[PDB]
Structure 1
Amino acid sequence: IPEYVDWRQKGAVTPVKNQGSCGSCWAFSAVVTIEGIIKIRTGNLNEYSEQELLDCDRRSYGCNGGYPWSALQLVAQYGIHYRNTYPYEGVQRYCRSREKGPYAAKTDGVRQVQPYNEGALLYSIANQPVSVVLEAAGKDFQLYRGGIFVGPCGNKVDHAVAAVGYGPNYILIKNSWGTGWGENGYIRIKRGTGNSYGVCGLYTSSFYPVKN
């Protein structure tokens, strides 16, 4: 795999979103990976519905948090609608898939990256955007403005995001806190420290969709 990856340069990443006060990061994270794999497999970049996963993933807890893996399983079992068909409202509502017509896209499964393994995560990122988790509660992460972030942070993961690239000293992360946070909505997080948790626990729990 190469020394630099940046799926934005391959046209596989949509604009940065803002989840608002709702604890829906798990759905935003999942959607980034769906947008990426559909572009990689079909050549078209589309936006898909975080709100649909928020409403319809019965294993997750709406705005009280949730699981990227179960959101991705929902897209593999059923499918997902375009964002315009099912736009983001920032509050959990009833699942309205069955009233919004046929699904726009469908995947074929979900895989987990071997946890606590930097090279395994880089290998997956070289192939597609990946859903990852990290500890975002610390003020240093909250106030990040730019540069390669080293912390301070612990490993008590609480926030799902998406890895869309990497370089020799960092992993490139699309956050869901709007374009005014970080590097136009992104953070580069230090890698190569030898801590098996990853900086801010970045290697704890990583999943990606499979699409034939």
Structure 2
Amino acid sequence: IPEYVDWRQKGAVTPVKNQGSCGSCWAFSAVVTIEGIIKIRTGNLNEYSEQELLDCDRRSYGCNGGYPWSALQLVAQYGIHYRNTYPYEGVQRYCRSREKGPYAAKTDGVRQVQPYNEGALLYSIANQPVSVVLEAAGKDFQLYRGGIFVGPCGNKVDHAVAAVGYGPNYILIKNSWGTGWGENGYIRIKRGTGNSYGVCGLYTSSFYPVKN
């Protein structure tokens, strides 16, 4: 696989979003992967609806939390509409998919990366953006302004984001806290530490959409 990967350089990553105070990171994380795989396969970069996942994933709890895999499972089963068709409101409302005409895209399934394995995760990121989870509640993560982050942070994951690239000693992560956070909205998390959980638990639970 390459020494460096950065899906933004291939036009496969949309601008950084702001989830607001809603507990919707699970939905934002999923949508980064969908946007990415649709560009990889079709050549078009579109934005897809976090709001739809919020309102429609019956397994998750709206702004009270959810699972990126559950959002991917929904998109594989029923598809997803464009962002302009179903815009973000940052609060859960009724599922309005049926009022929005046919879905814009649908995936073919959801796959988990072998967990607690840095190499397995890098191989998957070299293929496409991957939904990943980490421990992000800590003050130093909140106050991150840039650089390769080694901590401090714990290992009990609580935030879902998306890995959109990597280099020799970091994994590149798109966050959903706006561009005023970190590296224009991104964080580089240190890799190669030998810790199987990964830095801030980054290797705990990673998923990507299957799409031919």
How many percent identity over aligned positions?
A: 100
> Residues of 1 paired with 2:196 and 2:104: CA distance?
38
Post-superposition CA distance 1:132-167 (Å, at most 9, x none): 000001101010000000001110100000000000
Q: How do 1:31-42 and structure 2 match up within 5 A?
A: 31-42=31-42
> Residues of 1 paired with 2:202 and 2:22: CA distance?
22
Count residues with an aligned counterpart: 212
CA-CA distance at 1:37 after TM superposition: 0.1
CA-CA distance at 1:76 after TM superposition: 0.5
> Residues of 1 paired with 2:139 and 2:113: CA distance?
28
> Residues of 1 paired with 2:61 and 2:135: CA distance?
19
Post-superposition CA distance 1:53-108 (Å, at most 9, x none): 00000000110110000100100111000000000000000000000111100100
> Residues of 1 paired with 2:140 and 2:194: CA distance?
21
TM normalised by structure 2 equals 1.00
The alignment partner of 1:8 has SS state of helix
CA-CA distance at 1:203 after TM superposition: 0.2
> Residues of 2 paired with 1:152 and 1:60: CA distance?
29
> Residues of 1 paired with 2:126 and 2:142: CA distance?
27
> Residues of 2 paired with 1:120 and 1:26: CA distance?
21
CA-CA distance at 1:125 after TM superposition: 0.1
Post-superposition CA distance 1:111-147 (Å, at most 9, x none): 0001100000000000000000000011010100000
The alignment partner of 2:171 has SS state of strand
> Residues of 1 paired with 2:2 and 2:81: CA distance?
33
> Residues of 1 paired with 2:28 and 2:137: CA distance?
18
The alignment partner of 2:195 has SS state of coil
> Residues of 2 paired with 1:151 and 1:55: CA distance?
34
> Residues of 2 paired with 1:153 and 1:91: CA distance?
28
> Residues of 2 paired with 1:201 and 1:70: CA distance?
20
The alignment partner of 1:110 has SS state of strand
CA-CA distance at 1:177 after TM superposition: 0.1
Root mean square deviation, CA, Å: 0.3
CA-CA distance at 1:13 after TM superposition: 0.2
Counterpart of 1:187 in structure 2 is 187
> Residues of 1 paired with 2:117 and 2:57: CA distance?
28
> Residues of 2 paired with 1:183 and 1:136: CA distance?
15
5+ residue gaps, structure 2: none
Counterpart of 1:178 in structure 2 is 178
CA-CA distance at 1:192 after TM superposition: 0.2
Post-superposition CA distance 1:180-212 (Å, at most 9, x none): 000000000000000000000000000000001
TM normalised by structure 1 equals 1.00
Post-superposition CA distance 1:24-72 (Å, at most 9, x none): 0000000000000000000000000000000000000110110000100
Which consecutive aligned stretches of 4+ in structure 1 deviate over 4 angstroms post-superposition?
Answer: none
